[PDB]
Design a protein around this ligand. Structure first.
Ligand SMILES: Cc1cc2nc3c(=O)[nH]c(=O)nc-3n(C[C@H](O)[C@H](O)[C@H](O)COP(=O)(O)OP(=O)(O)OC[C@H]3O[C@@H](n4cnc5c(N)ncnc54)[C@H](O)[C@@H]3O)c2cc1C
Ligand SMILES: Cc1cc2nc3c(=O)[nH]c(=O)nc-3n(C[C@H](O)[C@H](O)[C@H](O)COP(=O)(O)OP(=O)(O)OC[C@H]3O[C@@H](n4cnc5c(N)ncnc54)[C@H](O)[C@@H]3O)c2cc1C
Ligand SMILES: COc1ccc2[nH]cc(CCNC(C)=O)c2c1
Ligand SMILES: COc1ccc2[nH]cc(CCNC(C)=O)c2c1
Ligand SMILES: [Zn+2]
Ligand SMILES: [Zn+2]
Lengths: 230, 230
């Protein structure tokens, strides 16, 4: 309690394992007295494309469109599309942002990549200068709760997919830490489609249990060493 | 006889540096006598979201929607949406697929992430046991031509962003190699926005020149060692 959480959720099916992980997070954080908001991207038909429709005012350079430049100015002028502004309000108010999603091509599903691309604009999430430890979302926590098709064994240094931490780099470091977030350790629920009932129920309960003490956790040192080793 | 190339292009502005790199690739490959096709994703208003609209007719399990299962079965039953099958035909016929895009959050812009999520479905691009070296698109070459906002120095092992090979992992290994592609060395045009006209025309010319001998290149060894090792 005394804390606000935003869950950005990317799964098409409410009855899915991802849906269960999202719901147990809402249930537990709600039980604790926290304020909780969920952005259910597919239900919202969230727009993933970075286009000129994201700026409603006079463009700074109408001859040659540069998304980064135009959205940075639009942010400062308050002429960004309202769907972006609505997400920014949720992020600005949140103390913790949890991303719940199935891994798609070692990354986030495109609808969620679009949320990253359009919501975390210059001026709001970072500035130049004003990134990594000086990012604009400093003071906030972020956590990736991911599900995979591959087993934990396949996601090891000697497994076919390499260690799971490798694919986390662009997301935890390149995006979240870049914007100033401190990153909590990822929650990775491996191969639920293959797992049995005991195992699946076990994974949901492990997440619920972890959430009970989430406010006591320290963030990870989001560095190349943590991700790649040596 | 001859070679066929598909360029999957993701930039909103034809006058952009990315647009110029795409245009010189078309110009040079065409000059060589190659068959060239371009999927200009923003112009096509390409759908990035993975949804149940990607399957036509009736679902294999209309009670609990599973995107991966449904698209695998739709591929086998020739029931995928036409935008997806149109892209699959271009890929099936291509000997080389060049992805041209600006780096967005250490990855591809969401519209291109959506093309990978929706076009590279099970049965078409990979299956059990067709993945990595036995991926279904084996025999085809793939190449990432990326532009960045960050300078080359920032993308060094000890630079703030880490080595560029770190972010290439999910794309080169987790996506392209996984589907069986032999991956040519990436073309990285660092910070064209900061560079001078000469450094610019230079980066373009370097890409045009590389394309002159693209068919003589050998694929990189797509391994954890290549991306992280020393
Ligand atoms: C485009 C695409 C790209 C992909 N790329 C990758 C990749 O790069 N790497 C990778 O490893 N995988 C990849 N995958 C696989 C994907 O990550 C998995 O399919 C996904 O993570 C599984 O999560 P889910 O919620 O969809 O599972 P579900 O299909 O929902 O399976 C979970 C099972 O648990 C049951 N369940 C639900 N809730 C509960 C509950 N409360 N208690 C007990 N059981 C419950 C369900 O009914 C179901 O049978 C990809 C998939 C697609 C479609
Ligand atoms: C959502 C988002 C997220 C991002 N995340 C990242 C990230 O993770 N890491 C990162 O490093 N960067 C990131 N960026 C920055 C992005 O990668 C760069 O802005 C992009 O790569 C620059 O390419 P461009 O084609 O848009 O450049 P342009 O701005 O189009 O640059 C071309 C410039 O060169 C001039 N020019 C002169 N000669 C030529 C010629 N020969 N051909 C063409 N133009 C010429 C043009 O007139 C123009 O001014 C992000 C940007 C956005 C919007
Ligand atoms: C259903 O669609 C997809 C699409 C792209 C994918 N990449 C990887 C996997 C799962 C692979 N796990 C195992 C070992 O079975 C995958 C599934
Ligand atoms: C790493 O993440 C991002 C995200 C959005 C961005 N927009 C622009 C840049 C690059 C700016 N580089 C310099 C040299 O200052 C950028 C980087
Ligand atoms: Zn970091
Ligand atoms: Zn590889």
């Amino acid at each position: 309690a005394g804390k606000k959480v935003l869950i950005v959720y990317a799964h098409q099916e409410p009855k899915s394992f991802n849906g269960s992980l999202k719901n147990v997070a809402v249930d537990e954080l709600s039980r604790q007295g926290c304020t909780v908001t969920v952005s259910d991207l597919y239900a919202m038909n969230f727009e993933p494309r970075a286009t000129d429709k994201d700026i409603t005012g006079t463009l700074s350079n109408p001859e040659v469109f540069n998304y980064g430049v135009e959205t940075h100015e639009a942010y400062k002028q308050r002429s960004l599309a309202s769907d972006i502004t609505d997400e920014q309000k949720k992020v600005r108010e949140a103390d913790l942002v949890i991303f719940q999603f199935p891994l798609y091509w070692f990354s986030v599903p495109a609808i969620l990549k679009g949320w990253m691309d359009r919501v975390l604009c210059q001026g709001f999430a970072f500035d130049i200068p004003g990134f990594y430890d000086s990012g604009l979302l400093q003071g906030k926590l972020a956590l990736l709760s991911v599900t995979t098709g591959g087993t934990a064994e396949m996601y090891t240094k000697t497994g076919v997919n390499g260690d799971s931490r490798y694919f986390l780099w662009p997301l935890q470091h390149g995006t979240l830490h870049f914007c100033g977030f401190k990153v909590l350790a990822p929650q990775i629920s491996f191969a639920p489609e293959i797992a049995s009932e005991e195992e699946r129920k076990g994974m949901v309960a492990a997440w619920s249990q972890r959430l009970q003490t989430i406010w006591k956790e320290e963030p990870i040192p989001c560095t190349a060493h943590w991700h790649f080793g040596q």
